[PDB]
Structure formats: C-alpha cells, structure tokens
Subunit: 297 residues, 4 copies
C-alpha cells in the first residue's frame, strides 16, 4: 500500500512558531525532488514538543499542500491511546491517507497493553495504520506474535521497523499471512531491510537527499541491488553526519543549508557543534559537486 | 529533607475519572500508617495517561489533604520542558515542597539537552528539584558528569536513581561536593542503595506496606542494617509480585484489596492475570496477619 | 577468496569420541550436495570441548577428505593467541587453505589486545585468515577501525561477521580498500548481509540443507534477491528449529535423521527436547521432500 | 563458610614464565597485610593464558605457601567441563580448600547444560565449589532457579556473583534455604552486596590494598556500615583506576609499584597508557602515606 522513499518530515520553526511558509515550500520541494510519500509529525518532526494544536495544524498543512500527489501518513504517536485517538481522528479529518502509531514509551506496557492501544486507535478511525516498532527509543518491543495479532485487524496495514534487528522482518513474515507494508525505520540498513522483504523506508535522510534516496528505494523495489548499494555508499557519510548528534538537529541544520528553513529545533534538541555543522556542509557541497559534474541534458 | 520512605503514589480511578474521594482517603491512610513523604503523579501515578488538568488536580488534592504533615514531591515529568515548567509552577502554587522531574524519554536528547531541560525547569520555579534518572524506561541516562553539572545549580537537590546500577551512586558521590538527596528508584535494592550512601527511596511498595517500609528505611538511616535486612526479607515477595506484570497494575490491585481504591488502571496498563492477583492476595494476607 | 555457501561443519561423535567415519562421510556428502567451502572446528564443530589434539586431527581429516574440491577454512579460535598460533600452524601443515580466528572471549581485551592477537597469528603462518567477529558469544567486538588495521595486514583476507548488526558491513567497507571476503556469520540475515556487500555465509543450516542453501547464496551472487528470498522462506522453519535450543544440538540431530551421524554432542550441549526433535523431523520430511 | 576479603590473585611473570619467587612473596605479603582468603588462577590470575601445567603449579605453590593460614579457593574455570574436572581434581590433590568455577562462556549452553557442567565437577571431587556467575564476561547467566537447583547438591556451597545486578542476591536468597556463601564479584558494589545478605567479596582491589579492603569487609560483617562506607570512599578511586583498561593490566602495574612483581601481563592483556599509570601511581602514593 505504502512503498518506497517516505520522508519523516522535519518541522520548520521561525520566531518560536511553526514556519508555515517554509513547511509549504518543503512539501513542494520534497515532492518535486522525488518523495514517494510524506510522514509529518513523527519524532523527526518534533512531535514531542509540538502543542496538540501545532501537531494538527502541521498535518493539515502538509495534507493540503501535497494535493494528493503522494500519500501523506500522519504521525499519531502517544503513550496514551486516548491522545493517539485524537491525533488519528484529526488526521483523517484533515485528509491524511494513513497514520503512523508508536505506543508504550516510558509507561512500558505489556504486549496485551500494546495490542489494546492499537486496537483503540484502529476502531476509532477509517484510515489505515502503520504501527511503529522502535525499542531503541520506546524500550517496549511489539513482538512478532503481537504483530501477527495486529495484522488480523483489517486496517493495520504495515510496520515501521526501527528495531535494527534484521532478523525481525523474517520472524514477522513467518507469522503474518496477509500482504503487509514492511517499512524500514533505519536509513543505514534500508537496503538490507528491502532485500529481506521490505518495501520502503520512512527516512530521515530523504529530507535532505530526496532524489538520491528515491532512486535508491526504486532500485531495491526493481530488484537492482547493485545500483541500490552504489547509491547507499554515496549517502553513507551523510547518514553518519545527520545522526552523529541527536536527530533532528542534523536534518534541520542540513535543510537550512539548502535554504529550506531555519536550523532551530526545540529543547531538548540542541544546536549542533561547529565540527558537526562543518562535516554536514562539506558532505552536502560534495554531493552537489558530483551531481553538477554528472548531469547533462 | 528529602529522606526515608517516600511513596510513589498510585492515582485511583472511578468510572473513567480521578477518584477524588479515594485519593483523599489514600493520603490520610498512607500518612497514618507511616509515609515519610508523598510523591503524586509520577510514573506509578499514571502521569502519562492523565490529562494536564488531571495531573494538576491530583497534585493539588494530595498537597491539600497532606496538610504539610509530610513532604510532598510533585511529579513534573515530561519529554517537553515547556510542559514540565507548567507542572512545576502549578506544584509550587499548590504547596508542593519539591518536584520530581524525568526528561528526554522517546526524543532521546544529548547530555546537553538533558541539562538544558532541567535548567529551564529550575529557573522557572522557587522550589527544589529531584532529577529522575531512569534509563530502563527513558533510554537516556543522566551521566555522572552531567549530574555534577546539575548539582552546581542551587535548586537541583537530589536524584531518584532508577538505573538499577548500584555503582552509579559511587560515581556520582565522587563528583558532587554539596549535600545531595540520593534516593533509590528501585524497591528491591533499596537497602543496597542506602548502604552505598543513599538516604531513602521513592517507593512503589510503600503504597501497600507503608508501616514496614518506613521501619526499614528508618533502620538504614539509623545504621541498623541487620534490622533493615530483616524487614527487606519480609517485603521481598511483595516487591516481586508488584512488578511481575507492568506496574502500576500490581500496586493498584493490592490497594483495592486493602479497600483503598478500585483496581482499575488506564490503557496501556491492563488487568492482572488471576495468578498474579492470587499471589498478591496471599502476600497481603501474610503481611496484614 | 571465499564466496557463497560455506559450511560451519558439525563434528560427529560416537561414545563421546570423534566419529572419523561419519566425519569423512559428511565431508563427501556436503561437497556432493553443494558446499562451496568447509569450515571445521568452529563452535558449531564444538571447538570448545575438543582437546587441542582432537581439534588438529579433525582439521587434518577434513582437509585430506576434501581433496581440494572446495576450500577448507580451519577454525583456529582461542582467547589465548599462543594457543591460536598452534592451531593455525597445524592447520597449515595439514593442508587447510585458510583459518577462521575468534579472539578475546572471556578475558575481554582492548582493541589493541585484539589487534596484537590477530597479528601474532598472522605473522606465524603463510596461509590467510578470516577474522571472526562475534560479540554475542565473545562480548568483545572488533570495531571498524580495528578491522581496517587488520585488513592492512597482507594475509588477513576477510571477516565472518556474526555481530547481527547489519550497519556494520557498511562501516567496514568504507575503510577497506582491497579484495576482502565479507561473509555473514548469521543464517537468518544472510540475504540482508549479501545485499549490503557480503559475498557469502559461513552457515550452520547449510550442514543440513547444503543444496538449497547453495542455491540461495548463488541467487544473491546473481543479483536475484527475489529468488534468494523465496528460498529463504522455504528454509525459515528449519533455521528456527535448528536454533531453538543451543546449537549445535539441533544440527547434530537433523544430520542424524539424514543417516549421516549420531545425534550426540558433548556437554554443556545437551540432548534436545522431544518437541524440538519432532519439529525438526517434520521439517526434514517437508524438505526431503 | 567463606567470608570477607578473598583476593582474586594476580599471577606474576618474569622472562615469560611464572615468577615463583614473586608469587611466594605475594602470598606472604597479602596474608601479612590482611587477606581473609586467596583465590589463585581465576581470570585476574590470567587463567586463560596459563598452560595447564602453569595453572596447576600456581595453585600448588599458593596452597603450599599459605600453609593453611587462610582458605585457598582455586580457579577451576572452563567452558569444557572435562577440563574443569582436571583443574578441580588437581586443586584438591594440591591442598586447595575449594574451587571457583565459571562455565559456558563462548559455547553459550542452556541452563540444563550449565547444571550438568557443575554436577560433573561436583561429582568428580570431594572439596566444595563456589559457582562463578559472570554474564558480563561469559554471556550465560546462571538464573536463580538454576542456582537453587545447584544448591540442592551437597558440595555446591556458594556463589561469586559478578552480575552487578544487586537484585540478584535477593532473588537467590528467596530460593535458597541452606547455609550458602554469597560472595560479591564486583569491588565497586561490595558494600551494597553485603548489606543485601552477602558475606564477602572475591576482590581484585584487595591485591593492592589488602589491609583497607579487609577492614572494610570486617566492618560490613560486624554491621558497621558507616565505617565500611568510609573505607569504600577511600578505595573508590583505586577501584576506578584498576578497571579503566582491561584487567588485570591495572592490578599488575599497581603491584609492581609496591615492589611485589613485574608489571607484565600476557596478550591479549596489554601495557597501560602513561595516563593510567600516572593515575595509579598517584592513588598508591595517597593510600600508602
Ligand atoms: Mg538482476
């Protein structure tokens, strides 16, 4: 249902507020340069530090600006399913095509608790859900048997797998007996994931290099792993630099270098070191040098 | 203070809302039966599933009913320091003695980001802060050098250490040169922690056995570690059973057996299995008889 | 130098002694049914419980019986480099083509200690080395910068990567600038590894299904990851059953069902449960055929 | 029945050999200066890089030189129980009072495999066994129910708990009813462990500060935890410096500063950095006047 390069969108700020002009421009620029889909207001979009009003406004503005050109999968994460229901219902009303749902961070519930959280969101809306499995941030882990129970629900349609355990997709595929949108939640292993049955990635780096990242994803989907790895290798220095300090500090700074938005993030995300800024700048300049050298029409 | 048996209070519910009557009764009962302090709307009080209004209401009701009889340390946790500031400012207005602050869960910031979060809360209020270090739930870990930097601020006055790493207190004590309220965040190792320089515990089990838990804590503070271990040995089965399934399901059920509140918690906390319920019932029967 | 499906050979026993008859038969059968190389006396071959002399005699037999038909990479693991040198020197004299070397388990040395271990083995022999990186068993982890230092040595020619960290190969590849045999040490992620730049796997499950595993590896080297994944899906139940209890108990039992050897392993590897045996038997029947 | 400060002895080397003269002198010096027991040829004694001949000779020499003044608990660790049996049998014939046994590193057996390993050693000797639980090095973890199963054997008499999980002793004490020597395997948390029911520590730091370490242990055993913590605070910098780089590099160098032996260890243990040497030198100077 949802395939390829799906961008975990940054949220631009100006004078302490959502930068609506920059956000609209970002949607247009990302679509122009090869986004296969957009995922506003996940943690890369600073969902934890947006107000409930800002969260909904960003989703609404992205859905409006996309104009149906690519799918929009709205973040509806919370550790409280009552809150997640509110985000998901709004997303549906604002014209999002699906929602992305993490559960259980900090309160650390059982598998049954995770299941009931997701069932609550599922039963409250009419659009599809991608469940978000990210033990490295949430501690809790949606286990394969739980994933299979979730897959029995008609509108749980995929997973953003940020476990970094590449055996996990195999364990899930052994238990899930319907088509399922397996999506990587880790840029560094996106190729490994698609070779293992994945069909895309909800990506941070695609904010910055949407054209290359789209080409890489399409190559994996067309079975051309030689071409995909070639592009992955080009992007590896960028990946390292974008994640060296806690994301989205890196992506926000990189986007500022491209003239897309201000570099600012909200606490507890902090400004980059001068060394990290320098490394990002040099990497971006090199990618542009290479593109200009190789381009011809 | 802050010292001894500090109760990580459960939040009672009734028909989907905060049970204000049970909450007032719980404050009275816990104080009557030996609480050294009360810590409303932490993790155990289901801070994640309370609305902002409910969080503030629970803090206000607990401070009101406590009537200054014991210290009240209000939860002011969030992964957004803007929100944490709102809880902490309300807590001060409501008469809390201090706030307990976790930071950085899920967004997973750097040491500098954690520092800036706590500094923002610190600068917005006049009451002190106990920082809450709980990597097993938050992933982020306030490292010893960061704790020392925090301790340089006048109103960062202690830590709830839920790392479960009993070497950590030693590493922090090596770097902190002012009096500091080192508090355990783990009931099972409360004695170990105080023997290593700790001066209390923000405790889940104390909801249910406040008298015995208070006696245990006081024994450690008076240097009678033989007596402390004797009581620990009585409480260890309770500790295990209250954490067998994800807390606070266990504490809420246990309190319901004591007639203190309804057993219900909010999703994603779920009802206990019949086995866990039975084991808790047996433990309560043994303790209160 | 090494590509495709390489088998981490089991070592068969009878009355607890090495069954040389079964071992020679296993070499012939595995080569007949599609092995690309043989890797005797790793942990799958129970290196930890073979005496030094048994280890050497097993390597010699496999090298001789292989008769140059496929490469033989002899295990020369130890946490003592002096012992590893003895294994590697014997392997060379016995006609092994290369050695597979783990280091640092239990004693848990630094990166420099690991480097010096491998350099000692390297400098003592004339045949090449595959470095074995397996933090899940050894705790120590050869970091990418250390791997690059190792690759600078002329006869370090590849790695068996059992980190299960699929980002690791990218990090090593960026730093290594000569032909280098990147080999998976994890059956479940073998396809992922090859998609990421790997060129084969030193496999446990290939002991039992060498023909299908050979076909899966071939597909990845052809660039047909769709066919590779279809084969992986056929082998999925087998992988799970072979690793349900601590390996090599599973592989040894499966090989016994094929008539190749007894199921016996040496303590602390223990007999399988009847459920695991039943599941493996069913899987073998489904595959064969 | 084993209590207090039990030294995880370093093994001194000279010209690539066991330094017998230094070893005898070390036994005498450590006993003179307050050792409550001696534990030769564990990993601090570089058991992984000693030959079988050296392992046995070091045990024999330490038992001989101790002359029954303090208990001698010989290392008989291996991931192969057949090898462990040989070490333990020799230890007994050499006059050791007990053996210390780790199992299962690298091969990573099941709980049943660990049990069978220990049972095999148990049944082969007449002297008692202290089980060595060290997941940080061995990965395998002897779980509380397995420890209880081991405790049902008559000559399994204690544990060296190097889990660094201070809840573990509580979980074990909840299951074990017979007299049992609970011993810490972690210097930094030795006080915490004894406050939780432990009765000693098999200690690395006690190699270097036996007098202070013995005083600290005795203080815990007498219930004087204030005194124990005072001494712990004096020793904490030493604990940190001795484990900064992979042990026993730190302990061997510190002992060399005291004139007890040469600083050398065997690969993969490597020489200390100048910074670490300087820090150890400053700590030694501070302690010894
Ligand atoms: Mg092709």
């Amino acid at each position: 249902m949802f395939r390829g390069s799906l961008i975990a969108m940054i949220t631009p700020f100006i004078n302490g507020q959502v930068d609506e002009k920059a956000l609209a421009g970002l949607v247009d620029w990302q679509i122009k340069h090869g986004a296969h889909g957009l995922v506003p207001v996940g943690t890369t979009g600073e969902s934890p530090t947006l107000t409930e009003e800002e969260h909904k406004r960003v989703v609404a503005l992205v859905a409006e600006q996309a104009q149906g050109r690519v799918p929009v999968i709205a973040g509806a994460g919370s550790n409280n399913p009552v809150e997640a229901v509110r985000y998901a219902q709004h997303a549906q009303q604002a014209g999002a095509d699906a929602v992305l749902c993490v559960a259980g961070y900090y309160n650390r519930p059982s598998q049954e608790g995770l299941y009931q959280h997701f069932k609550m969101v599922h039963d409250a809306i009419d659009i599809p859900i991608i469940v978000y499995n990210i033990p490295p941030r949430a501690v809790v882990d949606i286990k394969p048997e739980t994933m299979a129970r979730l897959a029995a629900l008609p509108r749980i349609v995929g997973v953003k797998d940020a476990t970094t355990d590449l055996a996990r997709i195999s364990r899930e595929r052994m238990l899930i007996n319907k088509p399922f949108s397996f999506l990587s939640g880790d840029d560094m292993t996106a190729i490994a994931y698609n070779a293992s049955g994945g069909q895309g990635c909800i990506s941070v780096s695609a904010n910055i290099a949407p054209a290359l990242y789209g080409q890489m994803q399409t190559a994996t989907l067309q079975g051309d792993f030689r071409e995909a790895l070639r592009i992955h290798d080009l992007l590896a220095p960028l990946h390292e630099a974008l994640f060296r300090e806690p994301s989205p500090a890196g992506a926000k700074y990189a986007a500022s270098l491209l003239g897309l938005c201000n570099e600012e993030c909200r606490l507890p995300i902090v400004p980059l070191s001068e060394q990290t800024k320098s490394d990002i700048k040099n990497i971006i300049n090199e990618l542009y040098r290479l593109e200009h050298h190789h381009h011809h029409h």
